[PDB]
């Protein structure tokens, strides 16, 4: 399949070179996989989700996304026009309030919720969790992310937007998950992206068009936007049978575009997520 005039980040993950505008992908499109978006919520009624999104848990008064951030991230995973894995199932877990903030105890609870809840769901091709959030280093937050991965979920986490070494941030610094940095449409490291030896992979993160609340769309930037590209790619590859939740991050790194990015400090991987699609 081919989506013409796609958002640049979708085109980039299906090309060996920057500057293209078509997203090439297998029609299976993540069908049979499930992605939990652990964030501010998801506006599940947005037409772009086609009935494939549902809220399953909130830690606040409502399950509504009153912010937009979670809806944008979910759209990059799996919306029709803006998503990597256009046929996946999306599950929302609201651990962040409508200002985009959350206490670490709530974020931990939401991770342990997903590890249990996935046993109630019919996800024959596997389960992914996308965490476009973080703060200062916490061994308890890292441990929760490690538990979620251990339970059989592919965990993708944002590196953070501090232009600093991700070793000082959580859950970015947990080695056993997939820590995602951000790039721009010219194959530069995004100016805000964290870096360091704990990063596993880069994905598109500057000027990313996706869904927003109120049935709308908008472009925003962050490692929060790169993370769902990798989560969606994992779901897509799991549906094709090319990898499993335990080894998807390694498979993505193995098969990435290598050496294409600029402004990568010595000691950080130069790897950009790539779907290797051949018609
Ligand atoms: Ca290249
Ligand atoms: Ca890792």
From Swiss-Prot:
Assigned keywords, A-Z: Calcium, Disulfide bond, Hydrolase, Metal-binding, Protease, Serine protease, Signal, Zymogen
What's an example of a GO molecular-function annotation for this chain?
Answer: metal ion binding
**EC top class named in words:** hydrolase
Residues annotated for Ca(2+) 1 binding in this entry: 175, 177, 200
Q: Does the keyword Plastid apply?
A: no
Cofactor(s), names only, from the UniProt record: Ca(2+)
Annotated protein name in UniProt: Proteinase K
What is annotated as the active site? 39 (charge relay system), 69 (charge relay system), 224 (charge relay system)
Known catalysed reaction(s)? Hydrolysis of keratin, and of other proteins with subtilisin-like specificity. Hydrolyzes peptide amides
Its biological function? Hydrolyzes keratin at aromatic and hydrophobic residues.
Claim: Mitochondrion is one of the keywords in the record:
no
Q: What processes does the entry annotate via GO biological process terms?
A: proteolysis
Record's family?
A: Belongs to the peptidase S8 family.
- Domain Peptidase S8: from-to ranges: 7-279
Q: Where does Ca(2+) 2 bind?
A: 16, 260
Cystine residue pairs = 34-123, 178-249
Q: What is its EC number?
A: 3.4.21.64
What does the cofactor field's note say? Answer: Binds 2 calcium ions per subunit.
The GO cellular component terms are: extracellular region
